[PDB]
Design a protein around this ligand. Structure first.
Ligand SMILES: *[C@@](C)(CO)[C@](*)(O)[C@H](CC(C)C)NC(=O)[C@H](Cc1ccccc1)NC(=O)[C@H](CC(C)C)NC(=O)[C@H](CCc1ccccc1)NC(=O)CN1CCOCC1
Ligand SMILES: *[C@@](C)(CO)[C@](*)(O)[C@H](CC(C)C)NC(=O)[C@H](Cc1ccccc1)NC(=O)[C@H](CC(C)C)NC(=O)[C@H](CCc1ccccc1)NC(=O)CN1CCOCC1
Ligand SMILES: [Cl-]
Ligand SMILES: [Cl-]
Ligand SMILES: [Mg+2]
Ligand SMILES: [Mg+2]
Ligand SMILES: [Mg+2]
Lengths: 212, 195, 222, 206, 204, 222, 233, 195, 206
């Protein structure tokens, strides 16, 4: 896996790859690593596939039960803490999860929480999670500004996953883009690295290490 | 020993190497030069196991200098890199192998081209536009994939290198006390004193 | 020390068409270098136009299929004989598998059938419950041999339109039941040649709106 | 399978059916390693009037088992009358089998019914039950498989059976360091219960 | 710490009608880190082609070693070495290091200049020869390559058709292996001409 | 592997399957396990494939030099002695399991050698992973005073038992007949009962399907 | 977690036109020691099923007791216990298969390999295998332990597939089984000469044969074998 | 989690705690506050195993806040420290112990004195004039032995603290991204924003 | 001690001196685990005209040793004439003792001199030498210590010694799974060398 999400002027960008591996065997190139919890909440998935998928769909059920009981959408903080408290109960049992709970509410504004399987829970503006997190960080950090436009922010997120997809052997397939605003999340398409790499190489002039 | 980087541009090769020497919970030195001049137009940086690194570098340096005196001629970077690779390829099947990783930056005067070679302790050689050893690569490679262009100048290369060091200083766990930068071109080897 | 797991070999394969779906699997059962049976079926009709196979450790595979078949039965009792949709079955199976997260069923599960729009569907599972709908999936011992061939022939991967300078991809299209069975038979004969745990016989289960049909073909017995 | 440093009952034990009933026989030695902890042990023990057993393996385990079996058969007698030898063996098995991982007890059960005459059941480490004409067990029994198979006959007399046990255990003792001391025997017949003992000076020079 | 799967890579070879093809990927990595996308694994000594997968230091070492040996061969014999003979030389050299072996999976390919017969062969790390009419595979995606070749291959393919078959075999196998890919090269070899084509593949 | 050796009236016959494995993967579907030590002394090999080839060639080389030195046709016991002493010296690490047979001025002979350097004599022998399947057939059908045609039938039947029942063995049956007073006849692919069936479909691609980045002519000439 | 102590070796079996045959030797091994020689490892259930068991004997005796108790339990409140509602081979097998898998799942297995042979009420042949792992499979021929390696090859030459079953008579089938038992005596170091054999026919019913011996053995050629290579004397 | 320091002076307790949160070869965050307010005049910093640290701190925080509501009264630092020690003393013999080390800085309003308690994950409590957990102590203790005086002011304490951080930044191997400093005195708890 | 997967020579071997000389005896079973690799093996092997040995332990080790001893004694004969049985045992010992770490070979040496008559030397795993009236060895010998000690007598006849060996090995075979097949024997006397064989049908029903 490579997954990222960063906060900026125009809300939150969330970008993920779609590869799944079993050792060196590429098992899938079309995995959905973003879970759509509700129109205002997203969750990213890295680590054990079953662990992430099972518990984040479970998280969605707990969020639904909150708004039925409280007649109000759950906060990003509360949603992330449900997941972090859950994995903490299983600490030492061998769960493998690197997740990011991203969303918007009125009281909080745009918010991102990093939550992992050893119980760590951190609020923050920028996070990259997965085997190719460092490759994404390299591109993202060196090009990040708070004042990025929605168009530029979407591209930087896409370009950061592409960078990791290229270098990290255990990342690839395609890029899934999301944009989170005050009005909720908006899907910005599936982008196959097969066509995207060459399109980016030609137009941007980058990737000069590769034989053109 | 930890961070060594290398970038080949249009007319030169630039090597950056961390200054910190750490043993246990103490930084013993913060001004260490992790490189040796093999010949006037060839420079080798190194990183790995304590003691092995310097012992290996100086041993190579002595051999290349011996060749230069014998033939009154400077070996090409390609020739030096091949010699270095073979020494490491011997080493890996010895009783006690050299645990040293190197970058060899040189300027070929016959071809009038800069050349950067990355060689690991196993004797694995590759020619590259940009290279790194250790955990550094996990950040710098993707960064350079994006920002690097083949026709860049030496000044553009130094800015590109500053971008790498900044990223490393932000996301690396250990304090590596900055880097010593050196440039290899048609006029030989020189050190950037203010980085 | 007692080891509760074992490897019974074999391999399985699921392909989805426009208005149909197939789930194939060889009939050979093995332990180490011995053949246990030349005909031991591991692809099962589970009712509600759902076919299922759980390949790997057969004891776990049988236990799982047995529990899912039972899950279908109780779904009818508890919800007024409602048909269990393929998507609902998939989610139910995830919970069966993840229920034993800390003592897993050592199997690769594949199910096939039709979705609620009448279109062909194939779902695949890992041992602990992660699942995904796909047009195509091979599982088991010879999955690594068959799967890339399916990427090339079913999803037309790495195939471009001739003369277009590698710019226009070969367009995706559904395959006929005749063309799919050709690919299944060729996949298994190829796997039989190069994998020792694969052979003896091939059993295919085809699923259309009319029901569940079967076809059987001989495979090399060495 | 023994716990570290626990007393070892490694033995030369045997039970032999014959015309008038059955005879149990055993050596007298206990070891911790190479040191003989007890040289005069009684390894033949009563669980009921005419149902006895030979003990081998762990001293502690076999004693704890035999004490429980004696309790069960005493309670059986109060409700249902005298138990069969098969019944006694079943109670031994149940304890040995269900606790096979925590126990080291190689037990031979031998008893005398009026209907069933002399019977012998052997129970090895696993907890399995084997009904036999005669049985041998303990560390020293290996050395006398050949001898006992060649020399055993069905429907022997009392004096012949006593000689068969004496000669057999004599050899087992001679070759097994874990066996030694006196040779104890117990005779089970319709007549009653008779205890016999045989000292080194006699049996060594056989 | 498994020498054969640290760097990654694959090689495949096929025969056709009066021709042979040999192909390889371009990746060199250090486990998860992709380092080089220019690392070719196919070499040639005269008209005899050798592909080598496995530990990259040994790939380089063996290339240099067989160049050494074939050069001396040619000087003494006064002729180029043939594929059948070279195959034996590779086997000898690998078995010489029986109890301290080179961690490689070599593949020979070429046309005998005297008889004109197409020839391919494969080896394990200690020199066991694997000859074949149809195809030879090697590398971290060998399972994948075996599956592709066994289904796609047919005998007596023309050079132009054979190119398509071997290329599709390599590409789709590489895409199912994490340590293989990052580019590819295909050699088409006829009696007295050799074409070399670089393939466009996904770069992840 | 499965390999056998059977003695008959006027000589000896050996046989072998032709499968070569790499874990569970069939590496070579038609490899030659029968090896010529000298013209009339042949060797069937099982175990580590490189070791059986290397050890058989080395002893075969030294046997040739010995034959030239002594001006005599080589004997089976010489090959036997040289092989066992070599294998013993390497304390089993050279994983060669051999059935050595042949005719010489002393007569016809049949032996087996194990990796640690132990030798055995017999009228019928079997080595390899399918030796139990083969030995079952040999124990059931072997008799004293076999003819040439009866021994070939028995030997091939013993290999077939390995081919069908052992996952380690498969494909074809190689045979070598060594009769006294005659040349030894090596019968490569004596039986071929595992022919691949016609494929359902041709996977010949349209020309231009593969995307290409660069072309270049390679220089093979001086 | 167990380790087997007193053990039983191969159980072999096959189908023929009208029924099934099953066999197993009478040995209870204690490691390399051939300790017990009067051990019956075929256990009939009713007049239509025979359960052959290999592996740990203490666990075998436990399984005996379960089957014995199963017959008793089936008879309770069952007027048709000796007719329509009698125990079928399929019922007996599925029960054992359930137990074996439950015990492996509790990490405390019954250390056995079991073959349930019998004939169903409708005349159909029943032959199925189950072991300590709960693994089950069926085939025209089935065998455990060595039997799997040596007997199956021989028995498959008679019945190689389903269509060969009607073509195989009880005479031909028994001959193959008896031959297989001889081969196992030649080659299995934990086997004995004495064995039991059982036939369950749809017409003639259950025939249980005890105290059989391996015979017509070839040992004469041994005298000609001298040394291990060179030795002439 | 790594560096937590504490200095008790004449009229206040000063706690300094590193901002870096590192996982693997990546610094995930550089602005982390490794402390929780237990009560208006009691502050606890923490360091140790990931997840355990925050889970333990918040659990203690909830318990002390519950006490404050029930009794309408603030527990003394000594009382809070004893409660915390007992929880860790229970924990160490549990199935899975809390691997958390803490410093408790408080101002006792009844005594009008500042108090600093150092408690490790075993439940080992000590009252100190200055304290540290982890490798930090190996530098800071000797430094404070020399420069510390008992009658120092809060400003003198902050300069003394700057001297510790500088030494750590010079000789520690890892980059801990500076510290968040907080002061506890008669007027409660406040954070120094510019350090 | 055995190397993993190597053929095991586990055996029932014995050598017995008697009035006219000495007789060696052995079973014919060779095993690889529980599979019988050879059912008709010859474990009695010639190192000199009238000096033979019984082999047990590792097949490879015993063969390699016996081949070296045969070489030494052939070279001894060319220089110094016929070697004594003691001399042969000494050469065996020297190999077994000096390589005790790398070898698993339990060898019984038996020979016939004219002066010294029949002699038997046994050489266990350690490499020690023990001169005895008779000797037993191999996995199956454990089961016949009792039988052989009770039944052996000095100065037996040929027919008595053959019966003693036949009955003994019969029992060893019956109880040891690692022993079986035919019973081979070799008779060493002044008359010469005689080979004997005995098949299962005969010896099993003894
Ligand atoms: C990047 C892509 C790689 O790390 C991401 O991290 C993704 C995250 C997405 C998928 C949510 N992670 C994975 O792909 C993940 C990596 C991984 C694997 C194993 C443990 C932890 C992390 N992959 C998986 O979870 C795979 C997904 C399969 C291919 C769909 N699953 C497995 O490997 C399974 C079950 C793993 C498992 C976990 C915990 C307890 C038990 C099992 N294992 C197998 O399938 C084993 N094997 C595969 C090959 O054939 C034989 C059976
Ligand atoms: C039957 C079929 C199986 O026993 C026969 O016995 C045949 C014998 C004939 C072919 C001589 N045996 C084999 O085919 C034999 C089986 C085997 C495998 C592994 C170890 C021992 C025996 N196969 C081989 O020897 C193959 C030959 C290949 C197909 C050319 N060799 C390998 O599998 C090598 C083993 C190398 C080895 C090293 C050290 C000790 C012993 C053997 N293995 C590999 O190449 C696997 N791997 C691939 C990636 O690179 C690293 C090695
Ligand atoms: Cl006692
Ligand atoms: Cl031998
Ligand atoms: Mg086979
Ligand atoms: Mg004693
Ligand atoms: Mg990648």
């Amino acid at each position: 896996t490579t997954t990222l999400a960063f906060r900026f002027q125009g809300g939150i960008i969330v970008a993920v790859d779609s590869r799944a591996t079993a050792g060196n065997w590429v098992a899938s190139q079309t995995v959905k690593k973003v879970i759509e919890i509700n129109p205002f909440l997203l969750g990213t998935m890295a680590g054990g596939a079953a662990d992430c998928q099972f518990w984040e769909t479970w998280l969605g059920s707990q969020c639904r039960l909150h708004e039925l009981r409280e007649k109000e959408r759950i906060s990003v903080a509360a949603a992330s803490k449900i997941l972090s408290n859950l994995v903490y109960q299983y600490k030492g049992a061998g769960l493998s999860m690197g997740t990011m709970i991203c969303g918007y509410t009125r009281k909080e504004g745009p918010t991102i929480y990093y939550v992992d399987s050893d119980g760590t829970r951190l609020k923050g503006d920028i996070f990259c999670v997965g085997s190719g997190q460092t490759f994404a960080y390299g591109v993202l950090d060196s090009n990040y500004k708070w004042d990025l436009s929605v168009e530029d922010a979407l591209y930087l997120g896409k370009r950061s996953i592409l960078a990791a997809a290229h270098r990290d052997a255990y990342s690839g397939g395609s890029v899934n883009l999301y944009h989170v605003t005050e009005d909720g999340w908006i899907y910005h398409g599936n982008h196959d690295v097969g066509e995207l790499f060459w399109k980016v190489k030609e137009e941007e002039g980058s990737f000069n290490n590769v034989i053109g | 020993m930890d961070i060594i980087l290398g970038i080949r541009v249009q007319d030169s090769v630039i090597l950056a190497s961390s200054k910190a020497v750490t043993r246990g919970i103490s930084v013993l030195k913060d001004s260490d030069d992790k490189t040796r001049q093999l010949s006037p137009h060839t420079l080798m940086s190194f990183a790995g196991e304590a003691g092995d690194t310097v012992q290996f570098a100086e041993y190579i340096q002595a051999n290349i200098q011996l060749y230069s005196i014998r033939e009154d001629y400077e070996l090409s970077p390609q020739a030096v890199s091949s010699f270095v690779r073979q020494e490491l390829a011997k080493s890996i099947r010895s009783r006690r192998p050299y645990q040293v990783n190197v970058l060899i930056g040189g300027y070929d005067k016959k071809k009038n081209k800069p050349e950067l070679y990355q060689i690991d302790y196993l004797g694995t050689k590759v020619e590259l536009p940009y290279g790194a050893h250790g955990y550094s690569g996990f950040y710098t490679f993707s960064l350079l994939d994006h920002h690097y262009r083949p026709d860049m100048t030496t000044e553009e290369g130094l800015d590109l290198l500053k971008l790498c060091v900044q990223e490393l200083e932000k996301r690396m766990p250990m304090d590596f006390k900055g880097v010593i930068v050196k440039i290899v071109d048609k006029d030989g080897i020189r050190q950037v004193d203010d980085f | 020390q007692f080891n509760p797991y074992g490897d019974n070999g074999g391999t399985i394969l699921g392909i989805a068409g426009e208005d149909f779906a197939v789930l194939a699997g060889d009939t050979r059962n093995i332990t180490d270098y011995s053949i246990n049976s030349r005909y031991e079926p591991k692809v099962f009709d589970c009712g509600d136009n759902i076919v299922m196979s759980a390949n790997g450790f057969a004891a776990d595979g049988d236990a799982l299929v047995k529990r899912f078949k039972n899950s279908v039965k109780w779904y009818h009792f508890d919800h007024n004989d409602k048909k269990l949709s393929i998507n609902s079955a998939a989610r139910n199976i995830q919970h069966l598998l993840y229920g034993k997260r800390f003592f897993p069923y050592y199997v690769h599960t594949i199910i096939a059938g039709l979705d609620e729009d009448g279109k062909g569907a194939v779902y695949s599972f890992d041992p602990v419950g992660s699942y995904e709908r796909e047009q195509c999936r091979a599982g088991g011992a010879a999955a690594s041999l068959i799967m890339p061939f399916l990427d090339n022939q079913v999803n037309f991967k790495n195939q471009y339109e001739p003369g277009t300078n590698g710019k226009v991809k070969k367009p995706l299209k559904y395959l006929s039941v005749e063309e799919v069975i050709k690919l299944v038979r060729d996949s298994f004969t190829s796997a039989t040649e190069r994998h020792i745990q694969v052979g003896d016989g091939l059993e295919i289960l085809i699923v259309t709106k009319d029901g569940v049909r079967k076809e059987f073909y001989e495979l090399k017995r060495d | 399978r023994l716990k570290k440093g626990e007393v070892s009952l490694g033995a030369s034990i045997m039970a032999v059916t014959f015309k008038d009933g059955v005879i149990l026989g055993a050596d007298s030695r206990t070891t911790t390693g190479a040191y003989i902890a007890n040289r005069v042990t009684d390894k033949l023990t009563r669980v009921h009037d005419k149902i006895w057993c030979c003990r081998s393996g762990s001293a502690a385990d076999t004693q704890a088992i035999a004490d429980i079996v004696q309790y069960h058969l005493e309670l059986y007698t109060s409700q249902y009358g005298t138990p069969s030898t098969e019944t006694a063996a079943s109670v031994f098995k149940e304890l040995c089998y269900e606790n096979k991982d925590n126990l080291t007890a190689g037990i031979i059960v031998a008893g005398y019914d009026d209907k069933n005459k002399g019977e012998v059941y052997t129970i090895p480490l696993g907890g399995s039950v084997h009904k036999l004409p005669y049985a041998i067990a303990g560390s020293g029994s290996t050395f006398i498989y050949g001898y006992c198979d060649k020399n055993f006959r069905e429907n022997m007399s009392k004096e012949e059976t006593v000689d068969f046990i004496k000669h057999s255990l004599s050899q087992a003792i001679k070759w097994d360091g874990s066996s030694g001391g006196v040779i104890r025997m117990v005779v089970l017949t319709a007549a009653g219960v008779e205890r016999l003992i045989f000292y080194p000076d006699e049996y060594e020079q056989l | 710490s498994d020498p054969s799967s640290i760097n990654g890579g694959i090689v495949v070879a096929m025969t056709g009608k009066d021709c042979v093809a040999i192909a390889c990927d371009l990746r060199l990595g250090s486990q998860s880190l992709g380092v080089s996308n220019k690392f070719e694994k196919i070499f040639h000594y005269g008209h005899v082609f050798l592909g080598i997968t496995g530990l990259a230091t040994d790939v380089t070492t063996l290339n240099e070693m067989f160049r050494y040996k074939t050069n001396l061969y040619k000087l003494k014999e006064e002729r180029a070495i043939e594929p059948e003979t070279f195959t034996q030389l590779v086997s000898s050299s690998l078995y010489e290091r029986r109890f301290g072996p080179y961690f490689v999976g070599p593949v020979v390919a070429g046309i005998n200049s005297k008889s004109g017969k197409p020839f391919i062969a494969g080896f394990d790390l200690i020199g066991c020869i694997d000859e074949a009419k149809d195809f030879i595979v090697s590398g971290t995606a060998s399972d994948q390559l075996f599956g592709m070749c066994e289904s796609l291959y047919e005998p007596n393919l023309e050079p132009e058709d054979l190119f398509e078959t071997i290329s599709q075999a390599l590409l789709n196998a590489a895409d199912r292996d994490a340590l293989s890919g990052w580019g590819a090269v295909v050699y088409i070899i006829k009696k007295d001409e050799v074409v070399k084509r670089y393939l466009k593949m996904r770069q992840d | 592997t499965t390999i056998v050796g059977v003695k008959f009236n006027n000589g000896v016959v050996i046989a072998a399957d032709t499968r070569s494995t790499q874990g569970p993967i069939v590496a070579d579907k038609n490899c030659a396990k029968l090896h010529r030590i000298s013209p009339k002394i042949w060797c069937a090999g099982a175990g580590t494939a490189a070791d059986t080839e290397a050890v058989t060639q080395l002893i075969g080389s030294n046997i040739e030099l010995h034959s030239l030195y002594t001006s005599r046709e080589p004997r089976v016991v010489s090959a036997l002695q040289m092989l066992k002493q070599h294998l013993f010296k390497y304390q089993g690490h050279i994983g060669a399991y051999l059935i050595v047979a042949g005719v010489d001025p002393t007569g016809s002979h049949l032996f087996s050698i194990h990796a640690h350097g132990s030798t055995d004599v017999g009228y019928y022998l079997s080595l390899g992973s399918g030796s139990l399947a083969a030995m079952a057939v040999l124990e059931s059908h072997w008799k004293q005073d076999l003819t040439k045609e009866e021994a070939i039938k028995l030997a091939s039947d013993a290999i077939q038992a390995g081919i069908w029942n052992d996952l380690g063995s498969g494909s074809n049956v190689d045979v070598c007949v060594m009769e006294i007073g005659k040349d030894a006849e090596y019968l490569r692919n004596y039986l071929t009962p595992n022919v691949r069936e016609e494929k359902q479909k041709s996977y010949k691609f349209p020309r231009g399907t593969t995307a290409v980045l660069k072309e270049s002519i390679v220089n093979i000439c001086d | 977690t167990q380790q087997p102590i007193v053990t039983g070796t191969s159980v072999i079996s096959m189908k023929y036109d009208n029924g099934v045959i099953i066999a197993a030797d009478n040995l209870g091994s204690y490691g390399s020691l051939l300790r017990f020689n009067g051990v019956e490892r075929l256990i009939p259930v009713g007049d239509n099923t025979v359960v052959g068991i290999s592996g740990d004997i203490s666990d075998m005796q436990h399984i005996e007791r379960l089957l014995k108790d199963l017959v008793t339990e089936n008879a309770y409140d069952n007027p048709l216990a000796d007719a329509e509602e009698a125990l079928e081979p399929s019922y007996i097998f599925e029960y054992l298969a359930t137990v074996m898998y439950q015990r492996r799942s509790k990490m405390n297995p019954l250390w056995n390999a079991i073959i349930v042979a019998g004939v169903q009420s409708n005349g159909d042949q029943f032959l199925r295998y189950v072991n300590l792992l709960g693994v089950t499979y069926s085939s025209p021929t089935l065998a455990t332990g060595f039997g799997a390696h040596m007997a199956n090859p021989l028995l498959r030459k008679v019945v190689d597939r389903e269509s060969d079953i009607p073509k195989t008579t009880v005479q031909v089938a028994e001959e193959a089984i008896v031959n297989a038992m001889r081969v196992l005596y030649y080659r299995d170091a934990r086997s004995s000469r004495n064995f039991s054999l059982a036939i369950i026919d749809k017409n003639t019913g259950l025939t249980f044969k005890k105290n059989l011996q391996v015979e017509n053995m070839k040992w004469d050629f041994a005298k000609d074998i001298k040394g291990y290579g060179t030795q002439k004397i």
